[PDB]
RNA sequence: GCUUUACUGCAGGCUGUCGCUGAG
RNA sequence: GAUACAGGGUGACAACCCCGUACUGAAGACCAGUACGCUGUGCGGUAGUGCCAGAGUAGCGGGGGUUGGAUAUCCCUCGCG
RNA sequence: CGCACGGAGGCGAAGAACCACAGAUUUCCGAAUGAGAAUCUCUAACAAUUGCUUCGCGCAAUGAGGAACCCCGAGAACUGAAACAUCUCAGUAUCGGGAGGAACAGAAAACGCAACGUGAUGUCGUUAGUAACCGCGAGUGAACGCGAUACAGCCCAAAC
């Protein structure tokens, strides 16, 4: 039979309808008064969190981060530039907002490592994402068969090197065939043309 | 007043001094910032790729 | 000017470094202080 | 661990202080206070220190002018070391 | 030279301390004679005194004082 | 470097529209 | 003399004056906590069953960047879904 | 008894010098962390940010460095086009963030010599200056496949 979790999932398919709509309209009022990174005891989307690796266990942390909506907050050129490079308004950053959110969270918890993250909506001027971070030094995690992998040295600052799920998709690594000629194995090894 | 020799006479102000962190006489005592190692501005050591030729 | 205790230690060291290569070092090495500094002609740090 | 007293500062001026003012001169550790100099001197030479004057010298060392009580004789204390 | 390692280990914790103060005093008196420009020195000892002191401190550390 | 009703663009201002955005 | 005629040193051109050199042997490090071996677990197959299987996603539209990617690259942003 | 061939003196058969491994000591400033300061000073200190928490800094983490290599972001212009705007130089220089001894990638919502075919991923050789782009100018420029190197395949979420 349907899991209870399937109901949370189904509700989030349409965040502008039903009970969820009323919930968001109420919550965001409190969220807009909260800071940039807020640690929360329980995930707003339990199903999504568990699906991404979350566990109600010691050393597993969740935090909601708000990031402004829109394009690059860019300064206009202050020296010679050909027309092509004179733009300001239409330039957008190459890292998606979700990834920015993930980095802001990881910076807040220097000892923790980003496991994954997901969206929890947006209003007219900002987006919110909840990031799942893990304590690679806590023994409750070092002994977990499903999570201990994140404790390895080569996983340090994984979010900053694009090793996150949002990092990998944003790097164009989703496809294994056509279209990934300049993305795999890395954008840098491919000359930065991905 | 000439901008050369006659203007060199008022130069008795101490600015750059021996830096606590790197030992170079670059710690600007007015700014409390070393122009050589970055002490006072950054925890990381001041360094730039342009301090050497590009392919080196 | 007003020198601090640390500045003073450094000035003291510079003065000591300003001595000559002892006579016996000449004999021992079978034959110059490249750091001879004059107060007027040269300039110390700080 | 560093010691307080380094060695006796023996110069013409130091002799005059010894002969005429019952004072002993020492090269002490620059981290040492007048009180620490007073104590160390009393314990090493078994005398009574009345006053200590200090100076950070242009040699990078600290000089202490230690005056002894009338009970003690600087010349005698110095003559035995 | 004159003071060997065996002799230091054979000493009791309290004997090493007393021996340390003794060596420190001989050193201080040698540095005093040196400061006075006094030549009745024997350069080997002032150097040996430093090593002997180091040895005693090393053994004091080895044996837990 | 400077100018302008030279060419081409880029900020900025004004204005419509969409999102934030809801009830009769 | 040579399984040693590489090289160097030595009061001038040295296989045989000295270090070495060939042969043989030893140790450490790396390979690697890997391979092999082992302990535990248990692979798989038939039939029935619409019980489960990752959403602002797949996909579409507006505006850009990027790419050899051209209608047919990858990515960002706003809206829809 | 360093470079370093002096003078004086000393050490070594109680086996020194010297070499290897291990240990002791290891001032002050320095990420620099009790606070301040041009290497000093003032009156107990994981400062700051975090995880756990006996909710007490009790147990832990981060910071900074490194020849380049590596990954993720920001991103010129001289120049070439015999001018120049798209294009080119070039995702280069330079800048911000960060890992390791190597990184990154990686067990197909692949390929599409279309097949009764291949079978994770890097890399090397080739495919090929081919296809594709481009004031269709100047220029730009892959991939599948193949021959090699090395080979390795698995864990969750959910159902119950
Ligand atoms: Cl991270
Ligand atoms: Cl094939
Ligand atoms: K140009
Ligand atoms: Mg690579
Ligand atoms: Mg001028
Ligand atoms: Mg002098
Ligand atoms: Mg005074
Ligand atoms: Mg381009
Ligand atoms: Mg401090
Ligand atoms: Mg041209
Ligand atoms: Mg032309
Ligand atoms: Mg190109
Ligand atoms: Mg292909
Ligand atoms: Mg399991
Ligand atoms: Na972190
Ligand atoms: Na001068
Ligand atoms: Na002295
Ligand atoms: Na001009
Ligand atoms: Na691209
Ligand atoms: Na779009
Ligand atoms: Na050491
Ligand atoms: Na710490
Ligand atoms: Na605490
Ligand atoms: Na030209
Ligand atoms: Na021109
Ligand atoms: Na073009
Ligand atoms: Na073939």
Contact A42, A61 (CB under 8 A): no
Give dist(CA A110, CA A113) in Å, integer: 8
Tell which residue, A148, A134, A6, A156, has the closest CA to residue A63.
A134
Q: How far is the CA of A78 from the centre of ligand 25 (A)?
A: 22
Cβ contact A105:A63 at 8 Å:
yes
Please report, for residues A39, A47, A155, the alpha-carbon distance to residue A140 in angstroms, rounded to integers and kept in the order given: 20, 22, 18
Q: Which long-range contacts (CB under 8 A, 24 or more apart) does C1-5 make?
A: C1/B14, C5/D30, C5/D56
Q: CA E44, CA E47: separation in Å to the nearest integer? A: 5
Bases of chain G within 7 A of a CB of the protein: 51-57, 63-69, 73-79, 81
> How far does CA A58 lie from the centroid of its chain?
21
Contact A67, A31 (CB under 8 A): no
Residues in chain E within 8 Å Cβ distance of D4: none
> How far is Cα A54 from Cα A49, in angstroms, rounded to an integer?
5
Contacts of B14 (CB under 8 A, 6+ apart): B29, C1, C46
**For residue B12, what is the nearest residue in chain C, using CA coordinates?**
C1
Taking the domains of chain C in order of start, what are their residue ranges? 1-46
Closest CA to A104 of A69, A135, A65: A65
- Residue D63's region, left for phi above 0, alpha for psi from -120 to 50, else beta, is beta
Expressed in angstroms and rounded, the spacing between residue A164 Cα and the centre of ligand 13 is 27
Measured in angstroms, how far is the CA atom of residue B22 from the centroid of ligand 27? Answer: 65
Q: How far apart are CA C28 and CA A58, in angstroms?
A: 71
Angle at which helix E44-63 crosses helix E13-35, to 10 degrees, equals 150
Closest CA to A15 of A54, A52, A50, A44: A44
Report the alpha-carbon distance of residue E24 to residue E30 in Å, rounded. Answer: 10
Quick one: A134 exposed, middle or buried, by C-beta within 10 A (0-12, 13-18, 19+)? Answer: buried
All residues of chain D having their beta carbon less than 8 Å from the beta carbon of residue E28 are: 5, 7, 44, 81
* Nucleotide at minimal C1' distance from the A135 CA: H51
Edge-to-edge, what's the strand order for the sheet holding A113-122?
Answer: A37-39, A60-68, A126-134, A113-122
Report the structure determination method: X-ray
Which option is the CATH number for A1-194: 3.20.20.70, 3.40.50.2000, 3.40.50.150, 3.40.1120.10? 3.40.1120.10
Would you give the DSSP letter of residue A1? -
Q: Which residues of C touch B25 (CB under 8 A)?
A: 45-46
Contact D40, D26 (CB under 8 A): no
Query: What are the b/e assignments for E46-65, b being 16+ CB within 10 Å?
Result: eebbeebbebbeebbeeeee
Which of A100, A94, A117 shows the shortest CA–CA distance to A40? A117
Phi-psi region of A27 (alpha: psi -120 to 50; beta: other; left: phi over 0): alpha
State both tokens at E47.
Answer: 């150097």
* Nearest CA-CA partner of A168 in A130, A127, A114, A119: A114
- Of chain A, the end-to-end C-alpha distance in Å amounts to 44
Domain that holds residue D57: 1-81
Give yes or no for a contact between B25 and B17, defined as CB atoms under 8 angstroms apart: yes
| Angle between helix A18-31 and A5-12 (nearest 10) | 80
How many Cβ atoms from other residues are within 10 Å of residue E43's Cβ?
A: 9
Decide if A9 contacts A48 (C-beta within 8 A): yes
Helix, strand, coil % in chain D, rounded to nearest 5? 35, 30, 35
* Residue tagged 């009574």 (tokens): D48
Q: What is the CATH number of the domain that holds D38?
A: 3.30.70.330
Question: Is residue A190's beta carbon less than 7 angstroms from any atom in nucleic acid strand G?
Answer: no
Separation between Cα atoms, residue B20 and residue A192, nearest integer Å: 41
D63 to chain C, closest Cα gap in Å = 14
CA-nearest of D15, D1, D9 to D41 is: D9
Q: Pairing state of beta strands A126-134 and A60-68?
A: antiparallel
As a whole number of angstroms, the distance between CA D52 and CA A8 comes to 82
Q: Where are the beta strands (DSSP E) in E1-65?
A: none
Nearest Cα neighbor of A36 from A99, A129, A112 is A129
* Residue carrying structure tokens 């000035």: C11
| Domains in chain D, number | 1
Domain boundaries, chain A: 1-194
Nearest in space to D37 (alpha carbons), one of D23, D54, D22, D21: D54
Residue with tokens 């300049």, as numbered in its chain: A182
Q: Residues A163-187, buried b or exposed e (16+ Cβ, 10 A)?
A: ebbbbeebbbbeeeeeebeebeeeb
A107 touches strand G (CB under 7 A): no
**Residue position matching structure tokens 């490079």:** A85
Question: A65 is written with which tokens?
Answer: 């981060």
d(CA A44, CA B54): 50
At a CB cut-off of 8 Å and minimum separation 6, what does E46 contact? E27, E30, E31, E34
CA E45 – CA A113 distance, rounded (Å): 61
Q: How far apart are CA E15 and CA E4, in angstroms?
A: 14
Ordered structural domains, chain E, with CATH: 1-65 (1.10.287.310)
- Domain C1-46 in CATH 1.10.1620.10? The answer is yes
CATH class as words, domain B1-56: mainly beta
Q: Is the CB of A73 under 7 A from strand G?
A: no
Nearest nucleotide to the CA of C8, by C1', is H40
The two three-digit tokens of residue C1, written as one number: 């000017």
Q: Which residues pair with A126 in a beta bridge?
A: A68
Q: Report the distance separating Cα A32 and Cα A37, nearest Å.
A: 12
Q: How far does the CA of A130 sit from the C1' of H107, in Å?
A: 30
Return binding residues of B for Zn(2+): 19, 22, 34, 37
* DSSP three-state, residue A139: helix
């Amino acid at each position: 039979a349907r899991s209870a979790y399937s109901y949370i999932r189904d509700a989030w398919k349409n965040p502008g309808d039903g009970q969820l709509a009323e919930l968001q309209w109420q919550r965001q009022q409190e969220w807009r008064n909260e800071g940039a990174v807020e640690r929360i005891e329980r995930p707003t989307r339990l199903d999504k969190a568990r699906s991404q690796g979350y566990k109600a266990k010691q050393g597993v942390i969740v935090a909601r981060v708000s990031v402004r909506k829109g394009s690059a907050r860019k300064r206009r050129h202050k020296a010679g530039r050909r027309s092509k490079r004179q733009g300001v308004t239409r330039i957008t950053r190459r890292k998606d907002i979700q990834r920015v959110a993930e980095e802001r969270a990881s910076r807040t918890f220097p000892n923790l490592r980003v496991l994954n993250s997901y969206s929890v909506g947006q209003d007219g001027r900002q987006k919110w994402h909840e990031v799942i971070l893990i304590d690679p030094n806590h023994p409750a995690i070092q002994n977990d068969d499903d999570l201990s992998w994140i404790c390895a040295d080569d996983q340090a600052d994984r979010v900053f090197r694009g090793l996150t799920g949002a990092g990998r998709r944003n790097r164009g690594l989703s496809g294994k065939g056509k279209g990934s000629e300049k993305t795999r194995p890395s954008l840098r090894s491919n000359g930065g043309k991905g | 007043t000439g901008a050369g020799t006659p203007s060199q006479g008022k130069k008795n102000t101490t600015t750059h001094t021996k830096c606590r962190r790197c030992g170079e006489k670059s710690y600007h005592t007015k700014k409390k910032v070393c122009s050589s190692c970055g002490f006072g501005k950054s925890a990381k050591r001041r360094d730039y790729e342009w301090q050497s030729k590009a392919g080196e | 000017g007003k020198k601090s205790k640390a500045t003073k230690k450094r000035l003291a060291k510079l003065d000591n470094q300003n001595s000559r290569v002892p006579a016996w070092v000449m004999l021992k090495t079978d034959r110059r202080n490249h750091k001879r500094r004059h107060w007027r002609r040269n300039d110390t740090d700080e | 661990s560093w010691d307080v007293i380094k060695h006796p500062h023996v110069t013409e001026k130091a002799m005059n202080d010894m002969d005429f003012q019952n004072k002993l001169q020492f090269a002490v550790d620059d981290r040492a206070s007048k009180g620490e100099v007073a104590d160390a001197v009393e314990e090493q030479y078994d005398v009574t220190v009345e006053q200590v004057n200090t100076q950070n010298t242009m040699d990078g060392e600290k000089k202490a002018v230690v005056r002894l009580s009338e009970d003690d004789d600087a010349q005698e204390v110095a003559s035995r070391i | 030279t004159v003071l060997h390692v065996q002799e230091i280990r054979d000493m009791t914790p309290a004997e090493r301390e007393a021996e340390l103060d003794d060596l420190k005093t001989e050193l201080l008196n040698a540095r005093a004679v040196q400061a006075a420009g006094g030549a009745p020195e024997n350069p080997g000892r002032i150097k040996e005194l430093r090593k002997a002191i180091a040895r005693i401190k090393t053994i004091q550390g080895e044996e837990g004082d």
